[PDB]
């Protein structure tokens, strides 16, 4: 059964982009999904997205503009200290100059670079580059 709505959204986005399409549809919509898209949007990796409102859960239609290589999710949301955050960027990021690792903390979800500025840590939920 559906055990991770976030994985379904990120997987569906990756498939359409890899095939060269321009738009995607996501069947279930949640707060974590929208907060994940907003982080990607502010860095220019996607465009506008719109949330149609059926009374059950709503859908999302995202607009693609290339520039996106992969967007994945880590299924067991591990606990990561602030001191060991550099282990992860060495693992699942192509290079040190660019790329973002998404965390969830008590101060909202944010990428791995803003968390360093605010000096906050938490749980890891995904990545995109």
């Amino acid at each position: 059964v559906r055990t991770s709505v976030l994985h379904d959204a990120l997987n569906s986005i990756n498939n359409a982009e890899k095939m060269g399409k321009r738009q995607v549809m996501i069947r279930p919509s949640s707060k974590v999904i929208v907060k994940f898209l907003q982080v990607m949007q502010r860095h220019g990796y996607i465009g506008e997205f719109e949330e149609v409102d059926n009374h059950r859960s709503g859908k999302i239609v995202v607009q693609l503009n290339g520039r996106l290589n992969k967007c994945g999710v880590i299924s067991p949301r591990y606990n990561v200290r602030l001191a060991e955050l550099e282990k992860w960027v060495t693992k699942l990021l192509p290079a040190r100059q660019f790329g973002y690792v998404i965390l969830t903390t008590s101060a909202g979800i944010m990428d791995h670079e803003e968390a360093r500025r605010k000096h906050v840590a938490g749980k890891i939920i995904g990545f995109f580059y």
């Binding site: 299924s75 067991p76 949301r77 591990y78």
Partner: protein, 142 residues
């Protein structure tokens, strides 16, 4: 594929690795301690014994020669084994009742080369060392 992946499944993963670890052959012989029990040497590197007789052993099929081994009974536990005397014309240095010292071929319990059923070689005889006698660096005591 097919592993448990949840955040509270540390018990299943630890138990599974312990069970499947026995299929390894190197680890299985370490855990059961077969060397301490079955090996003629008590898990040691060398051993001393007494020579009983001189035996010639035929080489395997592609080759053709006589390997000129020797029979020895271990002092430590009374077991009987056969050992190979290396180099050319070295049986003339091992008489009867000579207190030889042995070692392995380095294949860790398997026969080396074309010699069948031989796992040890003579290192010293009468406490002089075989190779030193071969190059005439010493004279065998009487």
């Amino acid at each position: 594929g097919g592993k448990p992946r949840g955040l509270n499944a540390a018990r299943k993963l630890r138990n599974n690795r312990r069970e499947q670890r026995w299929a390894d052959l190197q680890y299985k012989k370490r855990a059961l301690g077969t060397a301490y029990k079955s090996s003629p040497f008590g898990g040691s590197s060398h051993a001393k014994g007494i020579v009983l007789e001189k035996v010639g052993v035929e080489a395997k099929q592609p080759n053709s020669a006589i390997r000129k081994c020797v029979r020895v009974q271990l002092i430590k536990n009374g077991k009987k084994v056969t050992a190979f005397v290396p180099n050319d014309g070295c049986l003339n240095f091992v008489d009867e009742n000579d207190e030889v010292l042995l070692a392995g071929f380095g294949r860790k319990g398997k026969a080396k080369g074309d010699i069948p059923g031989v796992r040890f070689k003579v290192v010293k005889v009468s406490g002089v060392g075989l190779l030193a006698l071969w190059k005439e660096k010493k004279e065998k005591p009487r």
